[PDB]
């Protein structure tokens, strides 16, 4: 038997190894392909359970350039290097997030 090692988590994909730049990209490509509008959020580590993170800029509506998003993710991580950073994909039909996940813990 091996002993399970407990640590904090951050919802979807956080039981997987972190994401480089390539695996992030396939997630933004999925979202744009589902018609969802990508958005970027950040908040201090101790507040990641908050319902409302700080919004970086606005959602990228109608945006179809993965590299445009990827760069803004990088731009947010530079503005707040200690904050967590999250990627969300707004679904307008369901009034839900088709996807969300943390890119920098």
């Amino acid at each position: 038997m091996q002993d399970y090692k407990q640590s904090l988590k951050y919802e979807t994909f956080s039981y997987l190894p972190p994401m480089n730049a390539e695996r992030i990209r396939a997630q933004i490509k999925y979202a744009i392909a589902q018609g969802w509008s990508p958005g970027i959020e950040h908040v201090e580590v101790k507040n990641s359970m908050n319902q409302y993170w700080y919004m970086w800029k606005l959602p990228f509506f109608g945006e179809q350039n993965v590299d445009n998003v990827l760069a803004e993710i990088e731009a947010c991580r530079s503005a707040y290097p200690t904050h967590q950073v999250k990627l969300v994909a707004y679904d307008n039909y369901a009034q839900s997030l088709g996807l969300a996940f943390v890119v920098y813990r």
Binding site: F13, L16, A26, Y93, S96, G98, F101
Partner: protein, 450 residues
């Protein structure tokens, strides 16, 4: 019967309830007398006419058999389509619609077997029912969970566990990465585990595991009870102690009780997981009974936020989850079902699934589902937390694959083995064992109406 109740030229009204009955008649019966008999026996109860009938508009107050179809196969069975004016029923009462359709006709001597396949609930009647207390999208917002199916574990043994030992198994599961744990259908308030003590320790387990994972955690505390007063008392105590979700056995506890619990849940912001205990008594015999898709529509009107849903299968999952479900005989869906804005219900998969089923389950059910692992979690050789992590890793890697474009069911073993190179818990675990249609309709209607 046929004189009054067989109305082949009648085109149903958008406000009528419609029922599709699969009739298996005795050898010497004409199909139209049987269809008219089932319309009459499920609406007026009789074929005759006594003097009190003539005090009423007999032409309006009756069910109409308005079409008969063949069954591919059983040449001794036919589909009978029946219309019921919306005015035969009390509003806001699945109990009264249900009683009226199935309370009497199923003992009809003149058929060898009667099977209720589907029921068209008109949008004018849907709007009188309370519906899900929250529904898929509100629940994801409350629990802050997007992008994946949710994970759950039914605690076992159903029997013999103290409240505190029971809480232990809950804690070890929730801290492992599962979103929910679940009281069993039969767990109510037994001598070995009184409900108040269980609720307290489960909630302790839930808050300890939540604080150690930073993910919101739930456990479906079963409030199925001997009386409505006990049911409500148990639901109230879960709210008082902070529990986010409760459970009810909607068929065995009953439709009157469940409709009431659903409305209390919406009034109180408590999520409501529904168990379909005993559905199989009713829905398994293909020649006599009520099909589980009827039971599925009943529950969405009555009220649930989750529902256990086990071709036909993917039909009733759409019915449970989407805003509009078009008729599709290849899935046993005999009528268009419009739900309007009434929210959809999480589809719950359970029964003997483990990590190897993960790629298919993500593939079949999609994101808006709860996947409940009984022994698939507890039975892990390294304990409950390790098996929860294994199931959570498998689920998340199957979802990352699907998003990346891969055929998860065919590349299943490959997806799993690759992610197990980063998770010992997963690798050892392997060794041990509709929407687009509904939205296409909304856009089309938004532009030109009819």
């Amino acid at each position: 019967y046929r004189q009054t109740y067989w109305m082949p030229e009648y085109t149903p009204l958008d406000s009528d309830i419609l029922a599709c009955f699969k009739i298996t008649p005795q050898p010497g019966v004409d199909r139209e007398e049987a269809a008219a008999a089932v319309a009459a026996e499920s609406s007026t109860g009789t074929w005759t006419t006594v003097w009190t009938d003539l005090l009423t508009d007999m032409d309006y107050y009756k069910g109409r058999a308005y079409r008969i179809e063949d069954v591919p196969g059983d040449d001794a069975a036919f589909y009978a389509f029946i219309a019921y004016p919306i005015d035969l029923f009390e509003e806001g009462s699945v109990v009264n619609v249900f009683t009226s359709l199935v309370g009497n006709v199923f003992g009809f001597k003149a058929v060898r077997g009667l099977r209720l396949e589907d029921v068209r609930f008109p949008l004018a009647y849907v709007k009188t029912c309370g519906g899900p207390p929250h529904g898929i999208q509100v629940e994801r917002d409350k629990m802050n969970k997007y992008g994946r199916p949710l994970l759950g574990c039914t605690i076992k043994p159903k029997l013999g566990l103290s409240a505190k030992n029971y809480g232990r198994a809950v804690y070890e599961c929730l801290r492992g990465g599962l979103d929910f744990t679940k009281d069993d259908e039969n767990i109510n308030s037994q001598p070995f585990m009184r409900w108040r003590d269980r609720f307290l320790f489960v909630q302790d387990a839930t808050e300890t595991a939540e604080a150690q994972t930073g993910e919101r955690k739930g456990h479906y505390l079963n409030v199925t009870a001997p009386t409505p007063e006990e049911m409500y008392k148990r639901a109230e105590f879960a709210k008082e102690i902070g529990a986010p979700i409760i459970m009810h056995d909607y068929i065995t506890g009953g439709f009157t009780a469940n409709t009431g619990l659903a409305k209390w849940c919406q009034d109180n912001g408590v999520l409501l997981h529904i168990h379909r205990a005993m559905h199989a008594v009713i829905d398994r015999n293909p020649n006599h009974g009520i099909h589980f898709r009827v039971l599925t529509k009943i529950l969405r009107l009555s009220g649930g936020d989750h529902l256990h849903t086990g071709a036909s299968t993917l039909g009733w999952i759409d019915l449970l989850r989407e805003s509009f479900i078009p008729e599709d005989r290849s899935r046993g869906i005999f009528f268009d079902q419009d739900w309007g804005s009434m929210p959809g219900v999480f589809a719950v998969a359970s029964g003997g699934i483990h990590v190897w089923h993960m790629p298919a389950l993500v593939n079949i059910f999609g994101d808006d589902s709860v996947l409940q692992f009984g022994g698939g979690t507890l039975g892990h050789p390294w304990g409950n937390a390790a098996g929860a992590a294994a199931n959570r890793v498998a689920l998340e890697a199957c979802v990352e694959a699907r998003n990346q474009g891969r055929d998860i069911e065919k590349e299943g073993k490959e997806i799993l083995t690759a992610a197990a190179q980063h998770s010992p818990e997963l690798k050892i675990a392997m060794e041990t064992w509709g929407r687009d249609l509904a939205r296409a309709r909304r856009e089309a209607l938004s532009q030109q109406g009819k």
